[PDB]
Amino acid sequence: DDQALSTIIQLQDCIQQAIQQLNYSTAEFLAELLYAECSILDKSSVYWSDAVYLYALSLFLNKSYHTAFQISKEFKEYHLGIAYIFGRCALQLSQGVNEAILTLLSIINVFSMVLNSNLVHIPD
Amino acid sequence: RYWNSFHDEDDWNLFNGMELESNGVVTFAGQETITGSIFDRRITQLAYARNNGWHELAL
Amino acid sequence: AIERLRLWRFDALMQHMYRTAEYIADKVYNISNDPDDAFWLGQVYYNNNQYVRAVELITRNNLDGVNILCRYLLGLSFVKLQRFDDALDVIGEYNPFSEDGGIKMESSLCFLRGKIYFAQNNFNKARDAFREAILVDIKNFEAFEMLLSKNLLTPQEEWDLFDSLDFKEFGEDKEIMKNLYKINLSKYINTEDITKSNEILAKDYKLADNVDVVRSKVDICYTQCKFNECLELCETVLENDEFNTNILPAYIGCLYELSNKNKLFLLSHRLAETFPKSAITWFSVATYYMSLDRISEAQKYYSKSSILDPSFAAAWLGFAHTYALEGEQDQALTAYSTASRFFPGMHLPKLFLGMQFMAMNSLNLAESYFVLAYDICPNDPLVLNE
Amino acid sequence: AIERLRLWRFDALMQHMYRTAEYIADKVYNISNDPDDAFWLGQVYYNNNQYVRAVELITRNNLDGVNILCRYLLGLSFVKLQRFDDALDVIGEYNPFSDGGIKMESSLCFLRGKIYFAQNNFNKARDAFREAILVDIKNFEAFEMLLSKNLLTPQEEWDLFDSLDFKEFGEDKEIMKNLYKINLSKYINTEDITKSNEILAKDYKLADNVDVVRSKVDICYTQCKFNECLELCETVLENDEFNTNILPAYIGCLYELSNKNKLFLLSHRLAETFPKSAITWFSVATYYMSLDRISEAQKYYSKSSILDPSFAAAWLGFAHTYALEGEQDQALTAYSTASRFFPGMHLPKLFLGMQFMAMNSLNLAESYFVLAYDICPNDPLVLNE
Amino acid sequence: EITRPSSNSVRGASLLTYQQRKGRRLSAASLLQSQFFDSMSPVRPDSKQLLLSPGKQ
Amino acid sequence: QYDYSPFCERNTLRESRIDSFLKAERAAHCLVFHKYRPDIDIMCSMLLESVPGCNKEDLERLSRRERLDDIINHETNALKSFWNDSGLVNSLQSHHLHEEYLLLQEELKNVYKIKCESLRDKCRRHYSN
Amino acid sequence: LATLNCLLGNLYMKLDHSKEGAFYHSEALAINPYLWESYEAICKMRATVDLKRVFFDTLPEIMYNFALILRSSSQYNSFKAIRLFESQIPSHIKDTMPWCLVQLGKLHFEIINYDMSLKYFNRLKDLQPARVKDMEIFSTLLWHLHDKVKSSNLANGLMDTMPNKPETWCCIGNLLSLQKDHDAAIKAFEKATQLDPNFAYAYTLQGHEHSSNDSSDSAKTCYRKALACDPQHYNAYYGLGTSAMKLGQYEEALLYFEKARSINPVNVVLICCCGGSLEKLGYKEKALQYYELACHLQPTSSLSKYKMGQLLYSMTRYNVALQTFEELVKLVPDDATAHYLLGQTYRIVGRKKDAIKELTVAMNLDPKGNQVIIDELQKCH
Amino acid sequence: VTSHGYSKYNLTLWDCNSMDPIAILKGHSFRVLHLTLSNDGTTVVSGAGDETLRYWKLFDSLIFDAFNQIR
């Protein structure tokens, strides 16, 4: 447990570093590894939400829009970035746009769960 | 024909064009072909399956 | 409490009350994770021809191996489903236990292993499996009867096996069970001993005119060609049970030899209206045609009988006879070779193949096959005459 | 001395060594010469899929008049042998009588009810099943077979459930009553079924039981909570994929969700698993009609209807194929015959009224929408129509 | 290619019948299935089966 | 006892396959390990260890960022690269090396070509495909 | 100064030569160890690095274990990687990880074990219904299983979700090849490679379909295009070797077979093809060595035992030939020609009692050639 | 099929199993002498002085298991 948190943090920094450069397959594998590792931890902890958002972002970036759309649809309410990925996938495929609307309207109205984060591509 | 009237539908369908060769290899006719050695129990069930079972290529 | 539900489930299952029995079995299983209740549920699933559900029930929790009886049930369901590979997987290639008032559990598993090997046409391994099964527990009878009926052992080896096994388990019933098992042994060897044994069993005990004693008498008469007594005994037994499949092959052969066309037609129609699936009916129809000099047509019905039931010596031997009787001598050899290979342990196919080799006027091969047949059967007028 | 041989015969039946079972049963029967031994040998013959041997052996010495179990076994053998008039003659049309196990009179009454159901005189079948369930409550078939084919309106089913007594169960009646209560019809008194569901779930660890899950799926099916069917019956189908009771609801809730891949997979596996069951061909027909290939759905609903006459789903799907094909004159008689064959079931009457809408005769359709609405106060189809 | 003959009776035409005494089976679900496939047929089902049967090529 | 859990998630494997996997596995490892059980043990400057077709000398050149007998030396050397250190070439008779060599550059030269239109006509390819 | 080396490696991989690109991928790994894409690039070739110094000089240990798994998979040694999956990579990562499922299924499919790959990355397909990458392995496995319903499920799902992905049209073509048709499958693979070039598997399947269509030149051209797209692909090399064998020119057949075997050392089919090429060349002593390696490498393989027995009977090692034929019969009884060699060996050794039964079995198996079996029976006594 | 000449200038079909002709082919100015069979057994050729070549159309294992492991 002492080193368990360190591995997750280091992995998160690795995915951010990989996404910062135009290196996407490595980001794909690293996000996949973090998403698989975070399975044991409970849904209430933030780390699961951040890992799911990173995995969805990596899937969206790699043109595999369907998998990113499904993954984000699973946990769309938990994080704002997951909702962003859901909206991007909905615009790209024109599938399930209504659910995207019912999520984004609530997230925008409430602002003006997890809402803010330090991760990359966190929307404003 | 008289002695053949005593069949079930599926059993007769199995035996519609059945031909048994001397060496034991049996050929079964589908109204594909089910050429295989007899005296193994699985082949007859496989002929039954492709006879009454449903197979669909589905594009 | 739970015991009342368990006994109610048992009684419903015995009474063919399938819905209630499965219902109570499922709930007694959900109440307590006792694998015997799972075995009972699998039994109910097996009884109404729902094998896959029982297999998946016993496999889902991996409770097989914890207790042997559920393993036996799963293996039996697999062999019924013809997935022999997985049945051999769960049972094992050989005996794993090799160093109550019922049949020992390990003996049943070895019987199932022997049956699976027999289905896979591995006769050499099926033989040792059945021998081990009968040796481990003498309470078992299915392995003994399967070995005797399918002629997986030579008559001398069958007698040696019978002498080797003891009857210590039965105790008080030792002599009566010795005689009862001795009823079913193969002929051609010291038949007078069997006559004495069935004579002792007839008058001393109330089993004077039962099904198997008269079946043995019919077999003795048929081997000795005492066809008058053959027909008499077969009639006085069939008058009681009109569809006893144990005696029908001998009865049909007896009628063919006597050329009772009219009785044969009655039997053929009666079995056609009642048992169209079983190969006995179509064997009867084929031999009715055979008695009328219809070899060319009877070939098809022998083929039908062979297909509807494998491991039937009568059907395939009659098919080879239809081949050899009229012309087309070339592939009668192949038919007899198939008979010999697929039915090992009987001198008759080897003798027939040697006879046919004589018919083509090839001599050395005939002599070799006949010495093989004499090795298989020492006491038979046919082989020594040939 | 005979007791050891009897235990050996029972073990032989237990281990499914039928040749040995018949051998030992015949030996013990010849020794003792008592009718119970004949019953055991007849049961061995019945299990060996040889009914003629069993019926001949029972009838030979006229044992049916000696015990009460040999006659029942002979009647059941006649039933599965496709002979009905002589089976009923042996058993008797009416009641001749009007510790563990169950009383045999109840089993004989249930077999008479099954004969009547096979003979289509449905009112006599209802009478027989009601008498069987009132005489004995351990005979759960007298309940399940009665309720499965919807032989009676749910109201009288509830009244008979209230009338029958669980007292003789004693200590186990506390669960037996709720457990029997689970299986009644769901249209009326729906809340009580839910309270009983939680009652079973608590203090008896039966939340994992398949029957409770099936009742929950049927609850969700009625109120048209189709997503809940999908989730729950997917949870239970993973554990058991061939529960014949559960499959029709899954086929319906799949069709409503309008997904073809899962239904294709399930139907194609079932076709190679249970070729002679009507459920698999009904599933194939549902798949084709989800693919809008009505012509093949015609034949593959006809096959399922022929395989099981008491499979109202097949009748309704057949009439649906007729309606969707383009012609309605025959579909009119289709919904008429479906309504006539299954009295007390509102849905065929509703579909008949909808076809009457399609043909523009509203006078009659008023009455059938009223009779359908009498029992279904809250469901989208009735109110929309 | 011959299909299965139903029954083996070869009575054919006859002036007088002995077995026939007027009797009808009760209507059952198969019968309403049968009368239904007949509703779309302008000819007898037996004649339809004969015509639908494939002649030998 | 020999562990076979990873080979098949089914907990029980028939004994014939147990020996079939054990015999096959030891031979496969013994080929790689040598140019015993699997469950007891699984173990045993430029980063680049190896590349197909490069000898040790090629690696050193990379790290620095770079007549009958003689032809026979070039005869064998080319097949050292193409066959990834195959030991059968030493067992091949000399005159069998020539024809395979002639076909070697012939098939290689064919790769070099493979690795290396009017408006009306060139539209048909897109429509027809 | 880490991704620049990766770009160098990729451009070298793409344009002309793999050696310099693998070198620069190694340099990139030197700059930073967490560039998994470079590791995939190097593992696409049969090239390895010294992982102990890369990853050390528990996340690094997990990464090292995964690198060893990929290196073993690329090197085609599935046994060690399966064992590491057993010991390291705990379950809550192993089952969930889609890429681990891909690799594990490919590993099991490399061995003759077929049902387990189906189970594993069928669980994968359940986890990610829309996954398209590396599904040609499911297509090939389903073709090998001769199963049509799951192949149809795959084709319909992939067509519904991605009409345009190359894997989808490849699966459609594999299904068409499976059912009855070859020209439709050829058209299928042509469209599949037209939409996306550089897909060597499409060209390999094109060549296989052309070869099964008795069109040698088209299959050769498709295989050369596959090699141009991908320098290292043993399937196209094996296809070319089989084409050369059917043409009869054994020299380039042996060349192609050995080249294919070099990158896939453990494969009984490639070993047997190389041994047959050697026997055609006449190197009896060397041919046994590969066959001897093949038989020990994987028992329960009909072709390896059959060729072993044929070669031993050719130069008369009867003592070992008798037992290799006996075990060949034990693992399968339906071989027609094998029982003939069984009987010949039995008669040569001088055990007539087994010879007679064996020739009887051979006569049963081959009705047509019974006369020659009859002649051998005459020569038996 | 058998050629003919100097009597009817025709061709005769034959079935050796049942001994019954099926069809007769004629239409040659001079006698027919030259005949032959095709590879598939369908086409047949006639030779006669009429400078005609008449073409009729009267008619129409585990080793491979190891081959099909690699695809």
Q: Write the residues followed by a gap in chain G (C–N more than 2.5 A).
A: 57
- Compare CB distances from G131 to A10, A17, A67 and report the shortest one's residue: A67
Residue C134 CB: number of other CB atoms within 10 A? 26
Q: How many CB atoms lie within 10 A of CB A120?
A: 15
As a whole number of angstroms, the distance between CA C337 and CA C369 comes to 11
Question: In angstroms, what CA-CA distances link C321 with C299, C304, D144, F89, G321?
Answer: 9, 15, 56, 61, 38
Q: Residues in chain H, how many?
A: 71
What domain range includes position C123? 1-386
Q: Which residues of chain G have a CB within 8 Å of the CB of C365?
A: 374, 377-378, 381
Q: Determine which of C5, C7, C16 to mutate to test the interface with D (most D C-beta atoms within 10 Å).
A: C16
**G268, two tokens:** 């009984």
- Partners of C356 on chain B (C-beta within 8 Å) are none
Q: What are phi and psi of C278, to 5 degrees?
A: -65, 145
Q: Which residue, among G147, G152, G158, G339, would best test binding to B if mutated, counting the most B CBs under 10 Å from its CB?
A: G152
- CB pair distance less than 8 Å for B31 and E1: yes
Whether E6 sits inside 8 A of B5 (CB atoms) is: yes
Nearest CA in chain E to B14: E4
Answer whether C346's CB lies under 8 Å from C369's CB: no
DSSP-derived secondary structure letter, C291: T
Q: Phi and psi at residue H46, in whole multiples of 5°?
A: -120, 145
Angle between helices C68-80 and C51-60 (to 10 degrees): 140
Give me the residue label for tokens 């008479």: D112
From H8, C244, G309, G166, select the one nearest D41 (Cα to Cα).
Answer: C244
Closest CA to C278 of C252, C257, C240: C252
Alpha carbons C13 and C45: distance in angstroms, whole number: 11
| 3-state class (DSSP) for residue D228 | helix
The residue type at H48 = A
Task: State the chains in contact with C (3 or more Cβ–Cβ pairs under 8 Å).
Answer: B, D, F, G
Nearest CA-CA partner of C286 in C323, C241, C240, C319: C319
Question: Which residue pairs from D158-166 have beta carbons closer than 8 angstroms and sit at least 24 positions apart in sequence?
Answer: D158/D184, D158/D185, D158/D188, D158/D189, D160/D130, D160/D133, D160/D134, D163/D134, D164/D133, D164/D134, D164/D137, D165/D137, D166/D137
The dihedrals phi and psi of A114, each to the nearest 5 degrees, come to -115, 125
The token pair that represents G223 in the structure block: 């295989």
Nearest CA in chain G to H67: G269
* Residue B3 and residue C272 in contact, taking contact as beta carbons nearer than 8 Å: yes
Cβ-based neighbours of D229, under 8 Å, separated by 6 or more? D217, D220, D221, D249, D250, D252, D253
Q: Which helix (H) or strand (E) holds D254?
A: helix D247-257
As a whole number of angstroms, the distance between CA B38 and CA C116 comes to 17
D155: number of Cβ within 10 Å = 14
Token code pair at residue G353: 């009692």
User: Across the interface, do G152 and B59 touch by the CB < 8 Å criterion?
Assistant: yes
All residues of chain F having their beta carbon less than 8 Å from the beta carbon of residue C85 are: 14
- H70 contacts in G (CB within 8 Å)? 235, 238, 267, 269-270
CB of B59 less than 8 A from some CB of D? no
B2–E8: do the CB atoms touch at under 8 Å? yes
Contact C92 F14 (CB under 8 A): yes
Which residues 6+ apart lie within 8 Å of D284 measured at CB? B54, D267, D271, D300
How far is the alpha carbon of G56 from chain H, nearest alpha carbon, in Å?
39
Measured CA to CA, the distance from residue H25 to residue D292 in angstroms comes to: 55
- Chain D positions touching B52 (Cβ under 8 A) are 275-276
CB A12, CB A54: distance < 8 Å: yes
Distance CA D314, CA D278 (A): 9
Here the tokens at position A104 are 């984004």
Task: Return the partners of chain G (3 or more C-beta pairs < 8 Å).
Answer: A, B, C, D, F, H
Chains C and E touch (3+ CB pairs under 8 A): no
Q: First-to-last CA distance in chain B?
A: 41
Q: Among D312, F10, D364, C87, which Cα is nearest to G119's? A: F10
The dihedrals phi and psi of C64, each to the nearest 5 degrees, come to -70, 145
G167 contacts G136 by C-beta, under 8 angstroms: yes
Q: List C residues 81-140 in contact with D (Cβ-Cβ < 8 A).
A: 101-103, 108, 111, 139-140
Residue F36, both tokens: 């015993």
Q: Do strands H32-37 and H24-25 pair parallel, antiparallel, or not at all (unpaired)?
A: unpaired
Name the 3-class secondary structure at C346: coil
How far is Cα D140 from Cα D160, in angstroms, rounded to an integer?
Answer: 14
* Token couple for C115: 């049956």
Distance CA G155, CA G178 (A): 13
Whether residue G149 and residue D268 make contact (CB cut-off 8 A), yes or no, is: yes
Nearest partner of G228 among G216, G240, G246, judged by Cα: G240
Angle at D252 between CA D247 and CA D257, to 5 degrees: 120
User: With an 8 Å Cβ cutoff, is G364 touching chain B?
Assistant: yes
G48 φ, ψ to 5°?
A: -130, 160
Q: Are H13 and H3 in contact (CB under 8 A)?
A: no
The answer to whether F12 contacts C93, with C-beta atoms less than 8 Å apart, is: no
How many Cα neighbours within 13 Å face the side chain of D338?
A: 28
The partner residues of B33 in beta bridges, in order of sequence, read: B29
Identify the experimental approach: cryo-EM
Cβ of residue G90 closer than 8 Å to a chain F Cβ? no
On whether the CB atoms of residues D264 and D287 are closer than 8 A, the answer is yes
DSSP C73-123: HHHHHHHHTT-HHHHHHHH-SS-SS----S--HHHHHHHHHHHHHHHTT-H
H/E segment holding residue H57: strand H55-57
Name which of F11, D17, F13, D15 is nearest C69 in CA terms: D15
- Kindly write down the DSSP assignment for every residue of F40-108, as one continuous string: T------SEEE-TT--HHHHHHHHTT--HHHHHHHHHHHHHHHTTS-TTGGGS-HHHHHHHHHHHHHHH
Nearest chain B Cα to G367, which residue?
A: B23
Which helix H or strand E contains H43, and what residues bound it?
strand H43-48
Residue in the structure block whose two tokens are 């069987």: D132
Count of A-G CB contacts under 8 Å: 58
Decide if C15 and D241 are in contact by the 8 Å CB cutoff: no
Chain C positions in Cβ-Cβ contact with residue B17 (cut-off 8 Å): none
Residue identified by tokens 């055609």 is: G280
Indicate the length of chain D as a whole number.
385
Max CA-CA distance within chain C?
80
Residues of chain F found within 8 Å of residue G85, distances taken between Cβ atoms: 6
Shortest CB distance from C88 goes to which of F10, F11, F14?
A: F14
Say if CB A31 and CB A55 are below 8 A apart.
yes
Token readout for G139 is: 């297509």
CA-wise closest residue to C269 among G269, B2, G197? B2
Q: CA of C93: which chain F residue's CA is closest? A: F15
Q: What is the spatial distance between Cα F39 and Cα F27, in angstroms, rounded to a whole number?
A: 15
Residues 6+ positions from D244 with CB-CB distance below 8 Å: D277, D279
Provide the b/e sequence for C267-303 (b: ≥16 CB within 10 Å). bbbebbebbbebbbbbbbbbbbbbbeeebeebbbbbb
Mutate one of G351, G360, G371 to test the C interface: name it (highest C CB count within 10 A). G360
3-state secondary structure of H3: strand
Render G48-83 in DSSP notation, one character per residue: EE-HHHHHH--HHHHHHHHHHHHHHHHHT-HHHHHH
Cβ distance F88 to G205 under 8 Å?
Answer: no
* Residues contacting residue D1 through CB under 8 Å, at least 6 positions apart: C172, C173
* Cα–Cα distance for residue pair C129/C98, rounded to 1 Å: 12
The b/e string for D255-282 (b: 16+ C-beta within 10 A; e otherwise) is beeeebeebbebbbbbbebbbebbbbbb
Q: What's the token pair of residue D355?
A: 């076809």
In F, residues 52-91, which contact G (CB 8 Å cutoff)?
Answer: 52-54, 58, 62, 82-84, 86, 88, 91
The three-class DSSP label of residue F13 is coil
| Residues of chain G neighbouring H68 (CB-CB closer than 8 A) | 144
Chain D hits for E26, CB-CB cut-off 8 Å, are 119-120
> What is the rounded CA–CA span in Å between residue A38 and residue A45?
10
How far apart, in whole angstroms, are the C-alpha atoms of residue E40 and residue D142? 40
Phi and psi angles of residue G49, each rounded to the nearest 5 degrees, phi first: -130, 170
- The CA distances from residue C136 to C118, C165, C177, C272, in Å, are 19, 9, 17, 42
Task: Find out whether C237 and C247 touch, Cβ atoms under 8 Å.
Answer: yes
Task: Say which of H61, H63, H70 has its CB closest to residue G238.
Answer: H70
**Cβ(D146)–Cβ(D116) below 8 Å:** no
Pair of tokens at residue A68: 């990113």
- Measured CA to CA, the distance from residue B23 to residue C332 in angstroms comes to 9
Check residue E42 and report its DSSP letter. Answer: S
Q: What is the spatial distance between Cα C315 and Cα C286, in angstroms, rounded to a whole number?
A: 9
How many other CB atoms sit within 10 Å of the CB of residue D222?
Answer: 15
Q: Identity (one letter) of the amino acid at C325?
A: L
Strand partners, B29: B33
- CA G294 from chain centre, in angstroms, equals 14
Those residues with Cβ within 8 angstroms of residue A82's Cβ, 6 or more apart along the chain or in another chain: A49, A52, A53, A56, A72, A75, A76
- For residues G140 and G136, give the distance between their C-alpha atoms in angstroms, rounded to a whole number: 6
Number of structural domains chain D divides into: 1
Crossing angle of the two packed helices C174-183 and C211-223, in degrees rounded to 10:
40
Q: Give B45-48 contacts, CB < 8 A, sequence gap 24+.
A: B45/C82, B47/B14, B48/B10, B48/B14, B48/D275
8 Å CB contact between D23 and C210:
no
- Give the DSSP H or E segment for D361: none
Q: Which amino acid is at G57?
A: D
Sorted by sequence, the CB contacts under 8 Å of residue E43 that are 6+ apart come out as none
SS (H, E, C) chain A: CCCHHHHHHHHHHHHHHHHHCCCCHHHHHHHHHHHHHCCCCCCCCHHHHHHHHHHHHHHHHCCCHHHHHHHHHHCCCCEHHHHHHHHHHHHHHCCCHHHHHHHHHHHHHHHCCECCCCCCCCCC
8 Å CB contact of G152 and B24: no
Which residues of chain B have a Cβ shorter than 8 Å from any chain E Cβ? 1-2, 4-5, 7, 9, 12, 31
Tell the burial category of F70 from Cβ atoms under 10 Å away from its Cβ (0-12, 13-18, 19+): exposed
Task: Give the dihedral of Cα atoms C304, C310, C311, C314; nearest 10 deg.
Answer: -10
Per CB-CB distance under 8 Å, the chain C contacts of G300 are none
Residue carrying the six token digits 């798949």 = D287
> Would you state the torsion angle of the CA atoms of residues E36, E40, E43, E49, taken in this order, to the nearest 10 degrees?
-70
Question: Which of B19, B22, B59 is the best residue to mutate to test the G interface, defined by the most G CB atoms within 10 Å of its own CB?
Answer: B59
User: Would you tell me which residues 8-67 of chain F have a C-beta closer than 8 angstroms to some C-beta of chain C?
Assistant: 10-16
The neighbouring-strand residues paired with C31 are none
CB neighbour list of residue G38: distance below 8 Å, 6 or more residues apart: A26, G6, G9, G25, G28, G29
Strand pairing class (H24-25; H11-12): antiparallel
Which tokens is G137 given? 């392995």
| DSSP structure string for G135-183 | -HHHHHHHHHTT--HHHHHHHHHHHHH-TT-HHHHHHHHHHHHHHT-SH
A6 CB-near residues (< 8 Å, 6+ apart)? none
- Do C215 and D23 touch, CB atoms closer than 8 A? no
**From CA A39, how far away is CA A30, in angstroms rounded?**
15
User: What's the CA gap between G113 and G107, in Å, rounded?
Assistant: 10
Q: CA D46, CA D312: separation in Å to the nearest integer?
A: 31
Contact E5, B1 (CB under 8 A): yes
> How open is the CA angle D289-D291-D293, to the nearest 5 degrees?
65
Contact list in E for residue D333 (CB cut-off 8 A) is: 36, 39
Asked whether at least 3 C-beta pairs link F and G within 8 Å, the reply is: yes
Report chain C's C-alpha Rg in angstroms. Answer: 24
CB contact under 8 A, B58 and D264: yes
Contact by Cβ (8 Å): C65, C71 = yes
